[PDB]
Design the sequence.
């Protein structure tokens, strides 16, 4: 197998090293900022760098190990890197090493959205919560209906880390039946994050405004 | 400018077959080894099939060994991947890739890739195609307001969402779709607008679900 | 005044259907670098080092599994006193020839275990030349031993060109120039392999059906050699292979290009007849020199069956 760390962390400005082992042949390094989003070759053929990749990216190979080196790591380099190479006459990739570049903590601004009339006439009800431009990626959204803690009825998703400011945005969706929605009055979205001193609760009373 | 345009993917019948095609250009196709790499939902990169510069050598991942054929037409600058007897395990994003060598060595295939295609989603499912339902997310006040669209209960992926017919660009966030327990996807696209531009400007999201041929433009307005 | 000739036919079986054989003598014993590349749903490419034991080929090592190559390479085997040096080079198509050559080197001093490492001959000398696999040995030139990788031009200067290594195949920096004045336009050379006997350089190659040609080289100065054709033509016989026994040439011939029978001539005087009718011809009959008075004549009449003629020849005046 091709083996690389699961994760590596760094503070902006530091030199980063990710190692991949299992092959005595040519290593490739592929950066992917989002699953499904196409990888970007940072280094190929051990130490070859495409012209459009920043000079901080360098490659090296010693024995049966290849090493990716980022000198003066930038916030934008936070991405999962995959090594590529042959593994005993088999074309292969490592499991990925998710790198995190610790830019300054940014707290999320929270917004809450009530279900539209159009959705309510259809029969279902979805309350959305939006967390905007925060760092780090890790956050907790807790839904409360009439102050009652909701569970197993919500799903969240994060956007790709912004190319320019290196922040994230999370969207949590609370799904209830139209009947359940009309039973209760106050709908709340509680956000726990590193940037915040205490969970920010954004709420609304059904039918208001 | 190397370009790798992928086609022939999307919803497939379980047990049926697919025919991915990657039309290449901006380089000498006949000189390099080409191949397909796939990424399953929540999994990493797995190399699918590879082919030498002159098509005289091919390689296949064990998961596709027996039901796959990688061919190439150096005259048409094309690389084809046929995948017979499809399984739910083949549901993934597939990427056409160009190697920095001829394919005379196994490390040329996955250790020397210098160009990646944008990717093509392949869903191996027996479920029917369903158009989305677009609901507004009405803009609770400060200096900036957020408004959006909820693209709910569609299948399969993907959906394209724009704002004001491409006019609105910064501040937009199209969140990755989530797969509901029902087996249908739900997505949301939000945009941060000035708290003053509410009530003066009209904001419309343009949602396009190519598999069901559904194009819905929704006007989000406050109160 | 005293001539002795003794021939012995024998049969060796082989469990592997080698596309090409490459025989070599190591510690007075017969070996074979067997290329196995049969196309099939479950058939892989292999390169086996084999050893002739009794009436069978014994597979010792598979060198291909220790390399990164996807297809058939050029094999250059160099044998010294007790050393074996095998190189597996990537066969790069003429049009798509990159400036450096990647080979996978193998070294052994017992004929059992091999050290292996990949090497890269940067900006190599034989980019404009066609290569063909062969077994060889050291060539002494300026009180120095060299391994040779020689190529040929496809169809004005230097038709034949050699790359040399004085460090046991680690670096191929040396350039050995070959001056063949009887080179021709409109003709192509094939399967050029150097024949080294008692430190004299010679070449066996095909010219084109294709006809065998044999040149004798003499060291001019520095690393330059001057070659000239060595006529072995025999009327109603087709030149096949050349070797030396008892400080004299031993030459093999086919009746026609179909090779129903093969004739071995000793010093262009005495001859022996090889008729492949004991079990179907002698196509590809190749000499394997054991010592100054012993050698072998090997061909494969049918799939996996090796007719090995053991030849003893001497003059005891
Ligand atoms: Ca190559
Ligand atoms: Ca290579």
Sequence:
């Amino acid at each position: 197998a091709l083996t690389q760390p699961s994760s590596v962390s760094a503070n902006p400005g530091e030199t980063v090293k990710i190692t991949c082992s299992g092959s005595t042949y040519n290593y490739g390094w592929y950066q992917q900022k989002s699953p499904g989003s196409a990888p970007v070759t940072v280094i190929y053929y051990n130490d070859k760098r495409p012209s459009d990749i920043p000079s901080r990216f360098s490659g090296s190979k010693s024995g049966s190990t290849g090493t990716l080196t980022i000198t003066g790591v930038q916030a934008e380099d936070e991405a999962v890197y995959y090594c590529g190479n042959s593994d005993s006459r088999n074309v292969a990739f490592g499991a990925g090493t998710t790198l995190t570049v610790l830019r300054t903590v940014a707290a999320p601004s929270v917004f809450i959205f009530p279900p539209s009339d159009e959705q309510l006439k259809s029969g279902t009800a979805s309350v959305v919560c939006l967390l905007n431009n925060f760092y780090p990626r890790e956050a907790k959204v807790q839904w409360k209906v009439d102050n009652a803690l909701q569970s197993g009825n919500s799903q969240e998703s994060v956007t790709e880390q912004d190319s320019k400011d290196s922040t994230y945005s999370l969207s949590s969706t609370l799904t209830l039946s139209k009947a359940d929605y009309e039973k209760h009055k106050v709908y709340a979205c509680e956000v726990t994050h590193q940037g915040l001193s205490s969970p920010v609760t954004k709420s609304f009373n059904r039918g208001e405004c | 400018a190397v370009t790798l345009d992928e086609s022939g993917g999307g919803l497939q019948t379980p047990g049926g077959a697919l025919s991915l095609v990657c039309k290449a250009s901006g380089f000498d196709f006949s000189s390099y080894a080409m191949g397909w790499v796939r990424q399953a939902p929540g999994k990493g990169l797995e190399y699918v099939a590879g082919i030498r510069n002159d098509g005289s050598f091919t390689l296949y991942t064990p998961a596709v060994k027996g039901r796959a054929t990688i061919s190439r037409d150096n005259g048409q600058s094309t690389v084809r991947l046929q995948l017979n007897n499809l399984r739910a395990e083949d549901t993934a994003t597939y990427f056409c890739t160009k190697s920095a060598d001829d394919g005379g060595h196994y490390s040329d295939f996955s250790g020397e890739i210098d160009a990646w295609g944008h990717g093509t989603e392949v869903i191996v499912s027996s479920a029917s195609t369903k158009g989305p339902s677009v609901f507004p997310l009405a803009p609770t006040s400060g200096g900036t307001a957020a408004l959006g669209c909820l693209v709910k209960d569609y299948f399969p992926e993907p959906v394209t969402v724009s704002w004001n017919s491409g006019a609105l660009t910064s501040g937009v966030h199209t969140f990755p779709a989530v797969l509901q327990s029902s087996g249908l996807y739900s997505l949301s696209s939000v945009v941060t607008v000035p708290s003053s531009s509410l009530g003066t400007q009209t904001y419309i999201c343009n949602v396009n679900h190519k598999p069901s041929n559904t194009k819905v433009d929704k006007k989000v307005e406050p109160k | 005044r005293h001539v002795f000739i003794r021939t012995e036919l024998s049969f060796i079986k082989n469990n592997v259907p080698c596309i090409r054989d490459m025989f070599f003598i190591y510690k007075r014993e017969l070996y074979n670098i067997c290329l196995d590349d049969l196309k099939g749903e479950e058939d892989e490419t292999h390169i086996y080092v084999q050893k002739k034991v009794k009436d069978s080929w014994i597979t010792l090592n598979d060198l291909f599994k220790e390399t990164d190559l996807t297809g058939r390479p050029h094999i250059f085997a160099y044998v010294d006193v007790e050393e074996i040096i095998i190189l597996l080079c990537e066969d790069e198509e003429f049009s798509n020839r990159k400036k450096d050559m990647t080979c996978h080197r193998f070294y052994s001093n017992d004929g059992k275990e091999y050290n292996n490492a990949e090497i890269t001959i940067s900006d190599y000398i034989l980019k404009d030349k066609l290569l063909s696999s062969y077994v060889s040995l050291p060539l002494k030139i300026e009180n120095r031993e060299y391994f040779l990788i020689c190529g040929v031009s496809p169809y004005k200067k230097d038709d034949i060109l050699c790359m040399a290594s004085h460090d046991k195949g680690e670096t191929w920096g040396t350039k050995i120039v070959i001056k063949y004045d009887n080179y021709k336009l409109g003709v192509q050379y094939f399967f050029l392999r150097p024949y080294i006997s008692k430190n004299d350089l010679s070449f066996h190659f095909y010219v084109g059906v294709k006809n065998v040609n044999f040149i004798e080289c003499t060291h001019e100065k520095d690393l330059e050699f001057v070659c000239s054709n060595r006529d072995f033509l025999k009327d109603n016989k087709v030149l096949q292979d050349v070797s030396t026994l008892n400080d004299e040439y031993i030459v093999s011939y086919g009746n026609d290009n179909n090779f129903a029978e093969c004739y071995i001539f000793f010093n262009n005087e005495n001859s022996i007849l090889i008729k492949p009718e004991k079990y179907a011809g002698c196509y590809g009959g190749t000499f394997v020199k054991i010592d100054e008075n012993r050698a072998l004549f090997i061909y494969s009449s049918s799939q996996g069956i090796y007719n090995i003629h053991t030849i003893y020849y001497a003059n005891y005046e």
About this structure: The CA atoms of residues 24 and 61 of chain A lie 9 Å apart. Helices of chain A lie at 117-122, 178-183. Residues 7-101 of chain A form a domain with the Immunoglobulin-like fold (CATH 2.60.40.10). Residues 117-122 of chain A form the longest helix (6 residues).
